[PDB]
Amino acid sequence: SENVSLNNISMQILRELLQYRRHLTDPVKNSAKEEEIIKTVQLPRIEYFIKNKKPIEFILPAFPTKSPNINKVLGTAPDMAERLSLIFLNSFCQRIQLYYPPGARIIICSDGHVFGDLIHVSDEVISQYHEDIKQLLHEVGAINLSTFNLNDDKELCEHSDDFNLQRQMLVKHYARSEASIKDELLQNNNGLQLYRAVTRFLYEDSLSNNALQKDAKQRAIGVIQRSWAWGSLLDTHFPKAIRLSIHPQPADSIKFGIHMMPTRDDWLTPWHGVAANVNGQFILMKHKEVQMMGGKLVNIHGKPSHYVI
Ligand SMILES: N[C@@H](Cc1ccc(O)cc1)C(=O)O
């Protein structure tokens, strides 16, 4: 039949995707069966666009702000690493054109203002990081990529520059109770490793250790609650869209975790890391770990984009 043509296009996309899967890396897992599970998960969602002959669309919540711990990151400004990440994502969507001419698009949805209170990063700073990452797209000429923001939603606070209200509304209409968040996370090793990892980044950013520890553990459920709010917001705004995630996801999840640079850390993101030229291949590493490597910093446009080794 003709499903043979359609099934062949959808699989090539899924296979390209899988090459950049972000996952909890654990050898006891039969990777083969994980993928066989994901085939069933995403192939139908992909074939939706193909049957319609519509360009395939992805949503990805990412790039909310640069981590304020200069132990991890070079600067508040977006660094080369997102540049390299942004440039990767856009070319991913051009490749698909080589099979499937409508192509693909990715709506990067910024989550910077949603949890901005709990990160101790100014709403002023956040807004500039956003404006800059829009800036990068045009410098990059990354057409297949566009941006989605809290301000865009009609249902969100009218106009802008009342984030505290915007956050309240978002929590009201789309969030869940931190009590229900803590309960849901415990069930899985999946949910457990989110909790732990979210807290480790919150603690690492904030440098009384027992105080700061219980503190990061509470902010974690907070930040996670805000993120799933933004998640249900997009979950309704772009329902049939394929759902990319910046975090490792289970093979059963609707969300498909994805990487954008080489790194041995599953959870590192461009905002938490600097870019390193090591063996003539860029890698996402932490600013501290790379200085102990005797890396030399290189500056472009009067700002420090990356280190070299
Ligand atoms: N979303 C980040 C958490 C984070 C985001 C922005 C920050 O400035 C700091 C922490 C993560 O993957 O862990």
Write up this protein.
This protein has 309 residues and is of the alpha/beta class. The protein is built from ten helices and nine strands. It has one domain. The strands form two sheets. A five-stranded parallel β-sheet has the order 3-2-1-4-5, with helices on both faces. The structure holds tyrosine.
Helix percentage: 40-55%
Distance between the termini: 54 Å
Number of strands: 9
Radius of gyration: 20 Å
Class derived from helix and strand content: alpha/beta
Bound molecules: tyrosine
Topology order in helix (H) and strand (E) letters = HHEHEHHEHHHHEEEEHEE
PDB class: transferase
Keywords: Isonitrile group, aromatic amino acid, ribose-5-phosphate, transferase
Assembly: monomeric
Entry title: Crystal structure of PIsnA complexed with L-Tyrosine
Question: Brief description of this entry?
Answer:
The protein is 50% helix and 13% strand.
Task: Provide key terms for this protein.
monomer, 309 residues, alpha/beta, 5-stranded parallel sheet, 4-stranded mixed sheet, 50% helix, binds tyrosine, TyIsonSynPvcA, PvcA, Isocyanide_synthase_DIT1, L-tyrosine/L-tryptophan isonitrile synthase family protein
